[PDB]
Design a binder for these strands. Structure first.
Lengths: 191, 143
RNA sequence: CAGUCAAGCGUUCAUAGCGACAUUGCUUUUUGAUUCUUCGAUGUCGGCUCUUCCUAUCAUACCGAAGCAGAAUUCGGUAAGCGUUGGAUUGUUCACCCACUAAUAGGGAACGUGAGCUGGGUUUAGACCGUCGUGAGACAGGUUAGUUUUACCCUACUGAU
RNA sequence: AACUGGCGAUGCGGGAUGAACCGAACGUAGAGUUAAGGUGCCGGAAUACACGCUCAUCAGACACCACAAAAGGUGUUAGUUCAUCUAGACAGCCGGACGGUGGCCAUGGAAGUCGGAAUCCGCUAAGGAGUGUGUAACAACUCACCGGCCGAAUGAACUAG
RNA sequence: AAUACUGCCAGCUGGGACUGAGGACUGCGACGUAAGUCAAGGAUGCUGGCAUAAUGGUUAUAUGCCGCCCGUCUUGAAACA
């Protein structure tokens, strides 16, 4: 019902410097940098004094709020990336057939040997979405460590990497294996 | 309608503020209502813990200025897990009771208390001539 | 043909799989009413041939869900991309076997298709039986044989210059 | 079949199209004026102005006149009513949640939680003859409740664009 | 006090288009003492050019808009009558 002034009011810390080119932000954090095309929101962006920035919509709408709240959510997600950065850990499952897992290299493409995929002579190979940066989770079977700066850097990688082992052909509501997830974390852990 | 459960539940809860003029903020989150039911099987001594969802009770405790306007003070205790207690024991005699067992799972100075002594608040803070001039007292009675 | 609804079934459990009583729509590829056109008449059976359409999809492609150990299922989505047989009898249309496939989906094209084919049935006059009639005759009784022209014109189309 | 009105027998202006529909009927003409009917382009004549709805992986764009329902849909919009309703609940998160009590126990187990049986006194800010789980029983976890925040929303019936 | 609103004036000034139909005279009128005026039964004053295919008809061409064979029956024909 057209609430008369809608806005998101986000505290700015001091390890970060941005620059909003009239809608277009130049994000800089203690980890690195981000930007975004924000010429799809039509706000007045609002520095106060390096400790909060609002957006500004004169008389925002209902579904405009239904996206405009989580505007702040996804902004703060970008803050956690540009400062701190996510670091998940996933899972593997087999029961009978020991799946070899390897980040095999194709020219830095960083595929993944998936071998003995339930007796398959076919091999899977998964390239690495770069930016999100992965080590093997050592000392733990069936885990691995991703570390990026978007929640879809690491959860889109974990999403379609999760979609690697969409297993068919059996009574799979009984037959349960595959790439799963364990954990979600942070590049600087404890940040 | 929920506001007449706030007129009933805060008829009886906004009621006893000046009936029972003591404060006991009990920190019972995540409440073992098994054990805290058996609390009531034990509660035939003095009182019963009487809590509230204090953001739903936010405008209710905003409604607690009524009898001793000091009873709005459970909005200064809304974050943390918090609610209400009714008894006539004056300062800290029920907050020591509810939190321990079977649980979730002004005033002036006429007595300065220095080393078990009895000051009238006029001995230590004297005129420094009611004793400092009495340093030559038994010096004078001496000589 | 498709819903809505559920009494219940389905060990139990309405909804895996179903579904009592009820209810809403859809189709002309079925039958009723109907007489606008045709009696100075537009080749009506069946088959052959040959092409296209449609989807409400048989198979083939991808998927999803179950009262889906494997194996073997059900139900659904995307789905018309491509495919979806040979002979005995019967003019047959139809029908039924016998055999094969991944599978042997379903309809339209003036009930697609005779200056495209045949003419087996159908239907002159000839002839026979069974029934009915005095009879002239009648029999969706049975039976038998008994005359398929023409584009060098236009359009269409395809080669050609 | 009983009333009025047209075609027939009758033209002109609107419905892209229209026997019987919207205006209006007929001398030759001419100057001013309109119906019906309209003024993005064709298109004559305003992409004139004012307040709102809507965004449609199947809008919509109409007497004549040339068409969907039952059933729905946290889609939208707005309200209507009821009960919590700022006295803060709610959301979100921060802990236990009974002593008598395994009530009587049916007790090979049943300790709150297989199962019959009555449902206790209390206790609180909470504790239930137990809220389940965990259960040889259980322990214990757990949940009501009550204990920390927030400032306002909660729950139900709707109602129709 | 203003202002809306409405009605009245037989108040005052721009532009368009269309017309002169009629032919002595009457009449109706008004206006001026009269004379005389007038707008009172429909129009009367000042130019310039051509003096011809000038204008105009005609045919043919070309353009903007409209345009189902006659004759026939039926209530219904452009009719696949």
């Amino acid at each position: 019902m057209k609430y008369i002034q809608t806005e998101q009011q986000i505290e700015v810390p001091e390890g970060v410097t941005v620059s909003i080119k009239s809608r277009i932000v130049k994000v800089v954090g203690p980890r690195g940098t981000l930007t975004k095309n924000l010429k799809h929101i039509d706000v007045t962006f609002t520095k106060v004094n390096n400790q909060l920035i609002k957006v500004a919509v004169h008389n925002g709408g209902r579904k405009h709020v239904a996206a405009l709240r989580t505007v702040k959510s996804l902004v703060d997600n970008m803050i956690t990336g540009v400062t701190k950065g996510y670091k998940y850990k996933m899972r593997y499952v087999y029961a009978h057939f020991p799946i070899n897992v390897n980040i095999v290299e194709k020219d830095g493409a960083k595929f993944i040997e998936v071998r003995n995929f339930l007796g398959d002579k076919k091999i899977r190979n998964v390239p690495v979405r770069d930016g999100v940066t992965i080590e093997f989770s050592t000392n733990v079977k069936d885990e691995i460590v991703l570390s990026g700066n978007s929640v879809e850097d690491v959860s889109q990688n974990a999403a379609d990497l999760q979609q690697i082992c969409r297993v068919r052909n059996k009574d799979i509501r009984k037959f349960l294996d595959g790439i799963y997830v364990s954990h979600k974390g942070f590049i600087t852990e404890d940040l | 309608g929920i506001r007449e459960k706030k007129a009933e539940y805060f008829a009886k809860l906004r009621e006893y503020l000046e009936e029972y003029k003591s404060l006991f903020v009990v920190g019972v989150d995540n409440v073992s209502s098994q054990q805290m039911h058996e609390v009531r099987k034990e509660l035939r001594g003095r009182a019963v813990v009487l809590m509230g969802k204090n953001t739903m009770v936010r405008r209710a405790i905003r409604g607690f200025l009524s009898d001793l306007p000091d009873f709005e003070k459970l909005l200064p205790f809304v974050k943390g897990n918090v609610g209400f207690v009714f008894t006539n024991e004056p300062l800290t005699e029920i907050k020591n009771v509810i939190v321990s067992n079977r649980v979730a799972a002004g005033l002036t100075v006429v007595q300065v208390y220095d080393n078990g002594q009895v000051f009238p608040x006029x001995x230590x803070x004297x005129x420094x001539x009611x004793x400092x001039x009495x340093x030559x007292x038994x010096x004078x009675x001496x000589x």
